[PDB]
Each structure stands twice: as C-alpha cells, then as structure tokens.
C-alpha cells in the first residue's frame, strides 16, 4: 500500500537528463504560506483526478504507482520535480499500447479550484532529445511546414498576421483589399476567434460557413487565398467518399485556409487519422491575451502550462500562460527579481550553461514594454519564441516606410538569415516606445509611458 | 443598426435632463459650503475630489440619450482641464445659464446661426474688455494672496510656495511627492542634478553614508566601453597634479578599468567617481551639451568630428563641487561662460516650438530648469492619499494660477469684471435681429458665474446679483464673509488667462450644440 | 453594473447602517466581557478571533454603498496593521463616533471646512496633552503588566515575554515559530546563524552528528569559488603547522574541494571547515562585509587585486567559537576590537537612517540584532492551529505594545488618560461658532470610545462618566476587577502614540466623510 | 546629406524625377554605372537651395522645360491610374 518507497531519485536534474526516458506529469507540492500543509494534500489529488469507483489496474495488473511516486528533490528552495509515470505502464511487442482505462486514471493532473494560482512562474523543463526511441515527435510549425518556399524553425518565418487600421471589420477582399494588397506586411489576416457555429453564437453564424462559396477569386485573379476565412464546419462526415486521394487541393495550409482554435472544443482532435502524415493543423488562434484571466478584476481560466508539454504538435502562436505579475504591494525581496536574475553586476558562475540536452526556441512573452533601446534587458537567455515581434500600431501609421519592418511573415526570414545574436528578435525596428499611445493596459505603475494620462500636472 | 432619431425638444429634454444631472453634480461641488464627491473604484478606494470633469468622465446615466449627451458635452469639461483645472465651474455654470435661458425663452423658432454670431462676437468683446481690464501683480505677497484663494482659501502651502517662488524666481521648478512627511516642508537643490549613484560601493569617501563630496572636480565624457582609453594616464596625472578629483561619466566599464579603479582608489591619491549614463540615449546626447556649456567644456565622445582618443587637459570641463549618493548625483557648480550658456539658452528656445505635446517637451523644459537654477524639493501635508492628491491639485493649481498672472495681470474675483463689462458694452449691435437676441442672451447669460456662487451660499442669488451690480469697480461682495467688501483689499483676485479660455472653450461648444435639429441613438 | 446616483441624505441615509454594521461586528467585541467573531475562508477552516482589524480585513457586504462606507472605514484599521496593529478596536469606535457625529452636523449644518479645522486643532492639542501626560517606562514589571493587559492580562505568557525581553536585551528581536509541545518554551540563538550545513557525512567534528564546533577559529575569506586551482595551501599548509582551526567561506564546493576537506578530517591533516553562498549578492555582501569587519578579517575579492594564491597569512577572520550542524551554522561570537566594532554597527546605522524605511531596512536590522542582541525564539505549545493564530495574535499584540513603549513610554491605557485629556481640551475655542461647535462635537466624539467601554460590560454609563470626569489622577475604572482603583495599580499603561496615529487617522477620516454630497455607485 | 526611406520603386521614381528637375541624371545601379564611370557634371545642380532640421527645399531646377515636358508626357498617361483613390492625388 501507501504511496512512496518506489522511487528515490536523490539527485538534481542531471539524473533526469541522464535517464532520457524520464517524462514528468504533476503538480506542483509548493503549499501556500498562509494555506496550511493539510489542504495541500486534501485537493492535491484526493478528489480532483479520476472520481475513481472502488479502484482500477491495468491489464498488465500490478502497478505500484497510482499515487504521486514523488521523488521531489528538497533541500534549497523545494524545486519540486514530479513525474506521473508513462514509460513503466505496460509496455506491448508492436504498439506498447496500454489499456482504455490506463492513462484514464492517473495521468491528468486537473488543477481545477485549488489556490496555487496567484504567482507561479514555470521557466524549464521540457522532454530532452531521447524522445524518439518509441514516441512519434511533433517538431513541425507554419516555418517548417511550407519551409522549402522560404521558413527555417526558430524565429525563421511564420504565417500569422499584422493589420492596418482598420482593426477588422468591413472584410479587405471587397475594398480594403489594398491592405491585403500590400505583400510588405499585410499577407494574412485573421478576425476575431471567438466565432464559429457554437451554440452561443449571434446571427452571423450563417456567414462564417458562407464564406466558402466566395473562395472564387485564388485563382483566376492573380493572388492566393491568405485569410482565415472561417469556414471550417463542426460535423465531419461529408469528406469522406471523395477527396481522399487526389482532389486534395485545398493543401496542407491549415494557417492559411482558416482553422478554428477556441481552446475549449477543438483542442488537436485531428490525431486519430493523420497520426504522422499530417500531424500539423496550426494552432489558429488570433492573437488576444492579457485580457481573460491575468487582470486580478476578470479571472476566468486555469493554469495547465505543465500539461500542455505535448502540445508543440499544434505550432502554438498563442497560449494563455498568464503575466509577469507586476503591481500590486511590492518588497520583502521585491518582485523586481526579473531583473536581478541576470541584470545583477556582482553575480558570476564559471562552469555550466543552459544545456538540458535538447534546446528549442524557449522565450518568454514580451509583456508590458521592451525596446531595442533597452539592449541589456530580454535578450539573454534565447530572446526569441514561436512568434514574431508585432505590438500595437502607435507608431505604425503609415502606407509603406520602412517596407522591410512591417513584413510580418517575410521580414523575419532576414532578421534570421541575418545571423546577428540574440537581437534578431528586435532587430526589426525599435520605435515601438510610441505604441503605448494606443494600447495602456501594458505598462501602467513602473513604466513612464502612463504619466501623460492622468497624475496631476507631471511629466 | 438600430438607430433611433428624435427631433427638436422631442430630443432635447432627454438632453437637457442629463445635463441637468450633470449640473447637480456639480454646481455643489464649489464655494465655502459646498462638499466635493467620491469616486468608485472597483479595485482600489473611491476618491474624494473636486475634480469635474473627472466625474463627466465616470457619470453614467441608463437612458441612451442622456448618456451620450453627457459623453459629448465632457469634450468640454476634457478641454477646460486642460488648462487649468478650476474655473472649469464656471464654464459648466455659463452654459447651464445659456442652455436654461435660451431654451426657456427662444423655444427653438429663430436662427441658431444668428444667435451663434451674436454671442460669438459678445465673446470677441468681452475677451477686449478682460484685456484691457486685466490688472498687472507686482508683489510676491499678492502671489502667495492669489495662490490661497487657488488653494481653496489656504494660506500655509501658499506662502510655502510663495517663498519657493522667491528662492528658486521664475525658471525653477518643484517636485510632487507620495506619502513623505505628512506635514509641509520645502528645501531647495541647487545646481545640476544627475538620476544616477555610484555603481560601486567601494567609493566610500569622506562624507557620511559613503556618499562622495569633491570639489573641483574634472569631468569625463564617455560614450563606449574604456579599455584601451586606459591610456589617459596624461590626463590623469594632470588631475592628480592639480590636487582635485575627477569624475567619470563612461557609458560602459571595462573589467579591468573597474579593478584599477577599485585598487587605486583604495590606496593612493586620485580618488575618482565614476557612474553609469543618467538616462536614454537621445536624451543623455541632448545633455551632453548642457553638461559641455555649464561645465565650460566640449562634449568628449568618439561619435563628433573632434578626435577619438586624443585628450588635453582644456577638453575637460571645471566644476566647483559634486555630491553623490548611491541613488543620486549632483554637482554644485561649473567653470562656463555665460555667454555659450545662453547661446545654448537661445537655441533652446527654438527648441521650445514643438507638437510632440509630451516626451521632448518635458524633459527638455527640465534640463533646462536645471540650467538656470535648481529643483524644489517639497513633503507633503496631508493625511491620506486623497488629502495629498487634492493638496497637490490645488498646489499645481496655484501654480498655474500665479504663471497666468504675472505673464498677464489680474483681475476681481467672482467673474464681477465679466458682468461689468457686459453691462458696459450692452448696446452691442447685430447684423439681424436675431444676432441681437444672441448678445443680450449671452449677455444675461455672463451673470451665471455669481448667480452660482451667492445659490450655493445658501443665499438668494437675484438679491445679491442686483446689490452687486449696484457695487462697482473693485468694490462688491466677499460671500467668504457673506458680506461686502472690495476685493482688492480681500485679496481675491483671478489671472484671467483661465477666464479667457473657459469662456472661448464653452461659447463655442454651446454655439455649436444649440443648432441640433436631430438626435441618433443605438437602440437595445 | 449600470450607474446610480444618490443625493445628499439618501447616500448618508445608507452610510449610516454600514458602519453600524461594522460597529455590529466590532463593538461588542473588546474587553473580557467581550466576544470573538467567526471569519470562515472557504477553503480553509473557519478562524474565531477578537482582533477587531481582522474582522475588518475581509468586510464586505452586498450593498454597494455600505461597502463603500465600509472600504473607507478600513483604511484606519490598514494603517494600524501597517503602524500599530493594536487599538483596533479604538479606530472603530473612533468611527462611529466621527459618523454621529456627522450625521448630528448635517442636521445642524455646519461647514465642513470650519468643522474639519476643529477637528484637526482638537485633536493636535490631544497630542499635546498626551504628550504633557507622558509617563516613563523602563522597569521590566511594567513591561510584564503591559504585556499581560496586550494578551488581556495573561500573566504566564506576558511574563515569560518579559523575561525573554530582559536576557535579550532591547536590541534582542523575536521571532514566530510553529507549535509541536503543549507548553511554549523559549530559545536564544547568538551570533550569525545561517541555513548551511555539511555536505558530505564525514565532515563530522568532535561533536557527532557532522557538528564542528571551534572555539576561536581562523577564517578564510575565499572570495567567489575555486575548484581548478584547488591549492589554498599556501595558507592552509601554514595553519596546518600552526595546528589551528580552519574556515573556508567560498560560493561553491565541487568535488575536488570536497575529497581533499575529507582528506583533512580523516588522515588528520588539520581541522577545516568550509561554508557556501549564502544567497543573493546584496545580502551575502552585507553578512560577508560586517562578519570581517566584526571578526577583524580581510577583505578578499578577486574581483580585486587578490588570488588565493597571492594571499597573506594575516588574511584569516577570528571568532569565539562557531558551531555547524546537518543544515545550519552558527557564529556564537566573533573576535574584534570595541573601537572597530562600535565604528561598523555606527556605520551600518547610518545605514539604518535610509530612505528605504522599510523591509531592507528590516533586514538590516537582522544584521543590527546580530551586531547588538540576539534572535529570541518563543516556541509556542499550542495544540491546534487555530488557537496558535489567537496566541500569535496575542504575542504580536504584546510586541507592538512593548516596541512602542520602546520609543514613546507609556500611559494609562483604558481610555481614562484620553477622557483625562478630552476633559482638559474642553477649554478649546475655535474662530467662529462652526468651530467651536465642531470643538465640542470633537468632545462628545472622544467621549464615546469611554461610553462603549462601559456598555461593553453592561455598566453604568452615566455613573462611571461622571465619576471619572469628576475625578482625576489615577482614580479610575477596570474591566478585569470592574472597580474604580489607582491606575497603577490597575497598571493598564499603553503607549499612547499609538492611540495618537489611530486618532489623527480617525481625524483625517472624519474630515473626508463630512464631505458627504453625492454618489455614483455601479448595480448589483 | 540626405536619405530616403521610402519603398523602392516609388522612392526611385521620385529620386529621377529630382534629378530631371534639377537638371541632372541618377547615379543609380538600374544603370550599368557606377562612380568609377561619373563626372562632376553628371551631379545635380540648382540655383539656391534651403535645408532645414526637419525639411529640405529645392528653389531652383535646371531641367528646364526638356525634362519637364518630356517627364509630363510621360506622366499624362500615368495621371489616370488603377489604384483610383488618392494615389493619383498623390501623382498630382
């Protein structure tokens, strides 16, 4: 019985790094100061994991680990490391498969009411290049998929969009076609996501379907269809009989046909049949945050960063990590340390680097305000994500300027092939420290962007 | 898509009737008796304040119509403050008189055009008589009298600022402070003023707190990272024999040039300070000049067309004295010319005509207060956070106040001057007879200042109106007393800079929303 | 939601109930006769307690304008958490003195600005009077009568926090620690105690248990790390000769230093100790900085001219005797000259008067304690959580009542020393006769907190008011015998300057109700 | 000194439309020419010009009317355009 005595990992994350086939799935044990040790446990995974009728075992029978096997290392700061084992569940002769009722039980944590969300900033851990041996291995996004026409992986291109005011609405194709017109930035639009044939929809859930019989106008005009044009139908049974095989002429494209990606009924369901030919449908998600659950006034979400470890299938452009958490009351070893981690002068280590065999693009979000002028703040550790330097249009209001910055998704094929450091990622331009004039809600106690609007008469 | 018109008074009751809440809203909100409102926040406290247009911005009222006309008639309470603040009272009162009267008494049927001309050349006449009736203010006691009666007839801060005015003159400038002291105080910082401190400790010097205190000091200028610049041995020699310190203002430090100034600081004789870039790039370029000019020196960077490594002893600018913490830096006095220093002056004053509203602005009219003289360091009195804002309010306030009358002379309070003047140029004459109904509608309008101030002192106001029409020159009313008395000899006296602006700003909007015909709103 | 809007009475109207509310909530509360409230969070268990602030923290109703009234009435109790912590209780009544008192001045109609300057001038001569009133404390049975009347005359723990107080010494600062026994015990750690502990087993000294504990060790100050050089012998050989104790103080500890610190403690070289990082660069500067200057030790970076290998064997620290367990290590005392010593702990309180005033400045006052007292420890034997955070509630009570004696002293506590001085500023004149009413309203106001200490039990309101108003000196009531008596007999002597902070904020807070005009609220 | 940040071939366009005001010819590489083969002649030239810190203004042209008419009967079919809104406001 009990929970432990199954694994006594006693050594840092090395030993995890040694392993290779070492795949971590829990929550954090890290218990409040305030909440007090037995809640902890009580929420942790007493009720909130499977509902659990009597008990169930697999078809293998006999499996120690239904609890956390937690080899938590604590002696500094309690770092805690826990992993829901997957590689010691029954492992089968051609499909090492487990049974319905394996992976049903144990292996989503759901974090679902428990406190530990006010600050819970999770940097690094990720699944190292061993990952191979008997697992299929998503690596692809929108620069790897059309890569050959001029996309590398990290930083190197993207099919996500930047728009001319106006903002959306009144559909470019007709009229606005002119911002569409313009290959120097605007090359694909997206509208706002939360659309679609949803049960809480307005009147226009008609049109969004609709906009497929108007698909007239990609081949005989002299351009390529490049919006998200949401057309992409809920009920699947109608392709079935005939475009299998050779009227697959719509493309593998599934950022520039549109694709609707909510977040709470789509997910990447496309597993079942495309399992390595076509693993990649974008995470189509128009680019909204800070706005959901990160302002302490609105929160509404959950936190599950952890868990989505296996969803790089998707090619995120978007995912709701949170803030920064910066405001509120400040000291007893201020919430400045954002900076003291690397901008300290006094600090120094000899020896060891940021290696945990099997480096991807890892880069945190540009929140509140970063410029170039700023060159010692956010370019240490990669500098760069899945994503391309695009803020809010303050300063951006012109036809064409500097052409080569607003190219959105050929812009960055420079700034990478450039092969300058880690300042490809703004080397595009730096006068976005006029773009507070548009967008607020970014820079609002520490930043000077704010002092113009209200304060009494200060500059 | 859901549109809905309404015409005429069909529409403007529903107008009228979110202005007049907005008229309730304020209207009690001034005078001796008069309580100032909260404002609701959803995060934080709500805020007890006199601030008028704030509360347009947050009045919210169901009726579609009504809303909308509250939002479309903020633009002139956001204008208003954009100036000075108060007065702003007058302004909404004005347009209430001109909306009550009016509608009450032309009922639509004539020319709003006309009417617009009329009262547009009575405010073209009226600014005429303000100006020739504008009273120059001379002593600092009648500044620190004007200030009070911005202040909401308070008189501690007002002669603290007052004898602010008299040490720093016209060019210095003053600091706003969050929970300091709690009660007034004021000192004054003179000379340049630097937002850096020492970035290492082991600069411990004579003065306490380590901070570091050298007289004539030798400044260097430094745009790039000095490794090889090491190579000032002259130069520092020279320094050290001369006897006085040097300070460093390099933008980046070798490791090396580091250590050596570590180790021969420690032990030796050239004690050197040596700090990081005070700020941004385009605005530490700008005060490089200014260090350059008040220093008696030339800017030394690679980036000119000078030299890049070369270095004499005359590059160097001279200063009398540095005091710098760990925070903050400040030198005394520079050896310069007064003549390159206003040369600067004056091609700073070209540099005053801009648009870019904030950022330059700023920054330049700072730099170059510190040019002049120095920054007034002040703690606040007050209790509470609102306490101190509205202190602060009413501080920036009196400071406009005083700004306005010495560039333009003052004049009686009350508005007493307006009525006057009105009652003066009374056979104003129009094109039509509608554009004569505008001037004697504006006109009878012009009284509302008064009318509001004796209403809320809980008197009557045509009583008062009358007697102080009766009163003349600088003779009338003190309704602080509720009795007579001049207010020369009160000492309630307005900059008529804020009138004039008030006046134009409501005269138009009125003008402009009195030739409504028709009214859209969204419907539900 | 939308927006609503009150007017004068109809917002005082609903003010009203939601500080009565509040009083519901707090009122009945203090004294032994009073009660505890349950505030229940819905994870968590519910937490019964009598501090009034922390009933107050979680207020909240669903009215949006008496959860206005009651936001605004938190502020005070904030403020003591920030300041006091205690009186708590005295800022509400405190508030539902100032709200009848301003619903009184509504009535009557006085002008808030005359009312809140006699509000402001009562209660500046309160503090006067106070201070006139002042008594001296210094004796540790006061402090034991202090303590005990904090935790509502708890004479066992009171006591045993006076005793701690006394072996510590004032520069001794205590801690709060969990609760394992049923009775709380008491421990004194002196010297630096740090969370570093051996890393490997056989690091173990004499006293098992890998303790190594050395009575006037030698220390080295190993600036950073070393690992690839790995030869401090040139010290380390010498001291090995000198047959003398070892300390290390470096950042790292690889395996190399790790074999040859086995090597030393098995064949028996010489006995060497070695101690890691302690953490952030500001923190390990500090505790590096003061620990060398108390020691007498060198100041050894390689960050300046300095190598382990370029070293002195004068470089070594020394102390009295140090002890190092699993996970700690502690410097029981370290060997220094008074002059040098007295000279740092000058220097590190010129650091004390900083700007900061704040949790830095708490941490300095860790190193502070350490230069001077000593980290006291009282380990409490509760049983239950809950009744650990009512006796934590308790001891902290206690120790913001014995700091604040600290400083100010103390006086008769109970409110019969602030109806003493009420009664003396009963001969205060204000300007005009809305001055002297708010002068006597002020009166009433002070005299209310007493009132309600008398209800409290059930007591004679009348009897005890005339009695005590009459009487004067130390003749006064108690709650715990219920009895009139000498007030030092009663001993409840508190360190008023918290009742005066809670006051002026009580002030402050009445100054802004009494602006009651109008509210715009969100709906429900 | 001057640079010119605008897109490429409306920013060439305008660059020989300068130079045909003001009597001279591009150096430009959509010429096989570069400065090697150049002359002093071959700059620009004009009568009284005047630069300030935000602007720069041309007074003079030497192109005369040979430049001008021919660049106008070129610029006359190009004076009705596809683009339709504002870009030939813009040409004009």
């Known amino acids: 019985d009990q929970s432990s005595r199954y694994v006594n990992l006693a050594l840092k994350e090395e030993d995890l790094i040694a392993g290779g086939e070492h795949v971590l799935c829990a929550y954090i044990m890290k218990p409040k100061a305030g909440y007090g040790y037995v809640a902890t446990a009580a929420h942790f995974a007493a009720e909130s994991s499977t509902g659990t009728n009597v008990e169930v075992c697999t078809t293998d029978d006999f499996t120690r680990g239904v609890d956390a096997l937690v080899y938590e290392v604590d002696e500094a700061r309690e770092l805690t490391k826990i992993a829901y084992p997957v590689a010691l569940f029954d492992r089968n002769i051609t499909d090492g498969k487990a049974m319905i009722a394996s992976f049903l039980t144990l292996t989503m944590g759901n974090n679902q009411g428990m406190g530990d969300v006010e600050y819970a900033k999770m940097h690094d851990f990720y699944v190292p290049e061993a990952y191979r041996a008997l697992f299929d291995g998503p690596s692809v996004n929108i620069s790897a998929l059309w890569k050959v026409l001029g996309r590398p992986e990290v930083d190197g291109g993207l099919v996500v969009g930047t728009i001319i005011k106006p903002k959306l609405g009144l559909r470019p194709k007709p009229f606005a076609e002119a911002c569409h017109a313009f290959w120097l930035g605007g090359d694909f639009i997206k509208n706002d996501e939360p659309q679609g044939n949803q049960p809480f929809a307005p009147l226009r859930d008609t049109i969004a379907l609709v906009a497929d019989a108007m698909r007239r106008a990609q081949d005989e005009t002299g351009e390529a269809k490049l919006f998200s044009a949401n057309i992409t139908a809920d009920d699947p049974f109608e392709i079935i009989a005939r475009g299998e095989y050779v009227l697959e002429t719509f493309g593998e494209n599934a950022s520039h046909v549109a694709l609707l990606v909510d977040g709470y009924v789509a997910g990447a369901a496309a597993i079942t049949t495309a399992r390595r030919r076509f693993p990649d449908n974008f995470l189509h998600y128009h680019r909204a945050g800070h706005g959901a659950v990160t302002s302490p006034q609105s929160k509404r979400g959950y936190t599950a960063f952890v868990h989505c470890k296996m969803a790089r299938l998707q090619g995120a452009s978007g995912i709701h990590t949170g803030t920064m958490g910066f405001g509120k009351m400040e000291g007893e070893s201020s919430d400045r340390a954002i900076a003291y981690m690397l901008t300290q002068d006094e600090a120094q280590g000899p020896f060891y680097r940021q290696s945990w065999g099997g480096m991807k693009a890892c880069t945190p979000i540009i929140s509140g305000g970063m410029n170039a002028l700023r060159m010692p703040g956010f370019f240490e550790n990669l500098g760069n994500a899945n994503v391309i330097l695009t803020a809010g249009g303050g300063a951006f209001g012109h036809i064409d300027g500097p052409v080569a910055g607003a190219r959105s998704l050929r812009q960055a094929w420079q700034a990478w092939r450039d092969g300058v450091p880690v300042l490809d990622y703004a080397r595009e331009h730096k006068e976005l420290a006029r773009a507070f004039e548009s967008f607020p809600g970014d820079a609002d106690q520490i930043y000077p962007g704010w002092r113009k609007a209200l304060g009494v008469e200060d500059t | ?524």
């Open chain 2, 1 to 524: 898509a859901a549109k809905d018109v309404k015409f005429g008074n069909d529409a403007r009751v529903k107008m009228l009737r979110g202005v007049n809440v907005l008229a309730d809203a304020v209207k009690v909100t001034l005078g001796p008796k008069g309580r100032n409102v909260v404002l609701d926040k959803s995060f934080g406290a709500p805020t007890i304040t006199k601030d008028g247009v704030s509360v347009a911005r947050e009045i919210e009222l169901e009726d579609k119509f009504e809303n909308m006309g509250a939002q479309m008639v903020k633009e002139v309470a956001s204008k208003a403050n954009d100036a000075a603040g108060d007065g702003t009272t007058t302004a909404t009162v004005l347009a209430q008189a001109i909306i009550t009267e009016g509608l009450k008494a032309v009922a639509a049927g004539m020319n709003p055009m006309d009417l617009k001309r009329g009262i547009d050349k009575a405010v073209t006449a009226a600014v005429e008589e303000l100006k020739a009736l504008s009273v120059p203010c001379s002593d600092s006691k009648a500044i620190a009298q004007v200030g009070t009666i911005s202040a909401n007839s308070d008189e501690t801060v007002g002669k603290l600022i007052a004898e602010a005015m008299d040490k720093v003159g016209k060019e210095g400038v003053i600091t706003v402070e969050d929970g300091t002291g709690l009660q007034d105080e004021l000192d004054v910082v003179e000379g340049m003023q630097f937002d850096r401190g020492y970035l290492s400790p082991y600069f411990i010097n004579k003065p306490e707190t380590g901070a570091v205190e050298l007289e004539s000091p030798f400044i260097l200028l430094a745009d790039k990272k000095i490794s090889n610049i090491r190579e000032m041995l002259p130069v520092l020699e020279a320094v050290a024999k001369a006897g006085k310190p040097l300070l460093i203002i390099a933008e980046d430090v070798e490791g090396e040039a580091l250590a050596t100034l570590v180790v021969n600081t420690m032990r030796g004789i050239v004690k050197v300070a040596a700090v990081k870039a005070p700020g941004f790039g385009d605005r530490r370029k700008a005060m490089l000049q200014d260090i350059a000019t008040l220093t008696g020196g030339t800017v030394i960077s690679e980036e000119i067309g000078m030299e890049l490594e070369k270095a004499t002893l005359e590059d160097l600018g001279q200063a009398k004295r540095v005091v710098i913490n760990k925070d903050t830096t400040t030198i005394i006095d520079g050896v310069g010319e007064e003549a390159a220093i206003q040369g600067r002056v004056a091609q700073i004053r070209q540099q005053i005509e801009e648009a870019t509203s904030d950022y330059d602005r700023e920054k330049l009219q700072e730099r170059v207060a510190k040019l002049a003289g120095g920054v007034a360091v002040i703690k606040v009195g007050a209790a509470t956070e609102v306490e101190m804002k509205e202190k602060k309010a009413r501080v920036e306030d009196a400071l406009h106040a005083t700004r306005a009358a010495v560039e333009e002379g003052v004049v009686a309070g009350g508005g007493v001057a307006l009525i006057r003047v009105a009652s003066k140029l009374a056979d104003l004459r129009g094109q039509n007879e509608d554009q004569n109904v505008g001037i004697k509608v504006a006109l009878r309008a012009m009284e509302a200042p008064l009318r509001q101030i004796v209403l809320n002192c809980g008197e009557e106001p045509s009583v008062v109106a009358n007697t102080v029409k009766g009163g003349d020159g600088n003779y009338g009313y003190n309704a602080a007393t509720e009795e007579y008395g001049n207010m020369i000899d009160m000492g309630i006296l307005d900059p008529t800079k804020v009138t004039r602006s008030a006046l134009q700003y409501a005269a138009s909007v009125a003008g402009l929303m009195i030739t409504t015909e028709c009214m859209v709103t969204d419907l539900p």
